[PDB]
Write a protein that binds this DNA or RNA. Sequence first.
RNA 1: GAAACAGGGUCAGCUUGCCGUAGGUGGCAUCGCCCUCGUAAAA
Length: 291
Amino acid sequence: MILHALTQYYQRKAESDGGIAQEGFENKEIPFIIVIDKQGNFIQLEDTRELKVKKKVGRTFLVPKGLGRSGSKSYEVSNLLWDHYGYVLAYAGEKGQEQADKQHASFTAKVNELKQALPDDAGVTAVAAFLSSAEEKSKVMQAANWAECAKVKGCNLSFRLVDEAVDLVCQSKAVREYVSQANQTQSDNAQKGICLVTGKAAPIARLHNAVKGVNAKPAPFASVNLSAFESYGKEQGFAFPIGEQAMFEYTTALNTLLAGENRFRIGDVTTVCWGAKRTPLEESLASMING
RNA sequence: GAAACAGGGUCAGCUUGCCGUAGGUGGCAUCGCCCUCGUAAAA
């Protein structure tokens, strides 16, 4: 009942003010956010990096998912608004600026289609004009704040537009409904059965969402990657069919648990710990008592 | 839901006195004493 249980807990977190990502997001940490007006052009640069024992990568913002780069044609894929410096600002960082430019090229296009698919939000218009006039930040990326010089702890920056100061353009309502309906449409495009978890016919998710914490590297919960494990011609990640919506559900539930206090990580075997009726008052304890 | 290695090896070694010494001693009557006796045996 592994995956089904994970899904149960995701449902609990969603329904119980747990503030988990809503089917359409990941709580990616933004090292710093560019504050913009209707034209941006470096209205301000806030650095969010101020955090715990180390100078971390910002405040936890349930921004759209990391669409993942996966190497070769990295620049083609670009996260929705929050993204890599070369994608967003076309900051050089190194000779890998040309690719960054291409990164920027697609990121712009992404933002541009974000404007085209979702107009009437000042944020996307703002970032579009921002991309047009990134020179205003071409100085700022060495004027206000820095990216720790290769691709580290300043990378994965994002955009916040002035006049709200607390809500990221990524997590802005308008952009949110866009990304949710987009996750719905692209899902509708793909095949439609069957969930291993909800058991309903639903979009099968290739590339399970790489839950983070058990391995040192964030790792797939279940990714039939190598060719042999590819069992019955389902051939990569359909080998296991799980509803992509439910894929999100459980992978986020697992991520939260793995990052929650419930991680009594005995040596290798990290051990999350649910409660079907969440908050059974033992869930928080179960690590403290076995660890 | 077939085919699938825990694997290919890895001195516990190297070496180290249980020793240097250390009275069983000093010493203490076997004693004090006691009839083999009373006796029957020259065929």
